Amino acid sequence: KAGSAAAPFTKPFAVYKNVKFYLGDISHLVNCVSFDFVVNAANENLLHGGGVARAIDILTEGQLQSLSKDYISSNGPLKVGAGVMLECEKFNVFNVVGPRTGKHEHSLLVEAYNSILFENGIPLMPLLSCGIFGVRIENSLKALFSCDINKPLQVFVYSSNEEQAVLKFLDGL
After folding, report:
1. Among the four 29, 106, 119, 137, which has the fewest Cβ within 10 Å?
2. Which intervals hold domain Macro?
């Protein structure tokens, strides 16, 4: 929930330099914080049937998936590490593909986080590759903080376990 809003804001549970972290559903947080685009942790085929992808698709009333079908028909699956901005009616959604855990996960997460950073403006974004893709949250955080972050990021996590992982990670800096 917004504390208030000349542009919305809410208390992050942690801040490190440019990066603010929030515990919250993206469906809620799009009304809590200030951001220029939302980041969808997408799969290569831009099939947004589950997770944060489905939350964002529902927020865009199916526009994300329809724009994604067009993008795929014209351009093909996103490369792991790459992202594409799809401008929906109410939200610009940057769809970025984190790697699955294994070889090259760090460099690929770094490419993905850099693609977010190369978009204009402030993202409201999850950490990438956590959960289903199997990357340890600590490694996802490590990749993110491996990048030159010269703009504000609004980063969200869903569980108190993730929140503790972030606070522990941040403590070690």
Report:
1. 106
2. 16-173
SS3 of 61, please?
coil
Which experimental method was this entry solved with? Answer: X-ray
Q: Residue 120: helix, strand or coil by DSSP?
A: coil
CA distance 166 to 7: 26
| Euclidean distance between CA atoms 23 and 39, whole angstroms | 16
State how far the Cα of 133 lies from the Cα of 88, in Å rounded to an integer: 26
- Cβ contact 103:109 at 8 Å: no
Q: What b/e readout covers 67-106, taking b as 16+ CB neighbours within 10 angstroms?
A: bbeebbeeeeebebbbbbebebeebbbbbbbbbeeeeebe
Give 37's strand partners. Answer: 123
Is 138 within 8 Å of 170 (Cβ atoms)?
Answer: no
Give dist(CA 95, CA 78) in Å, integer: 9
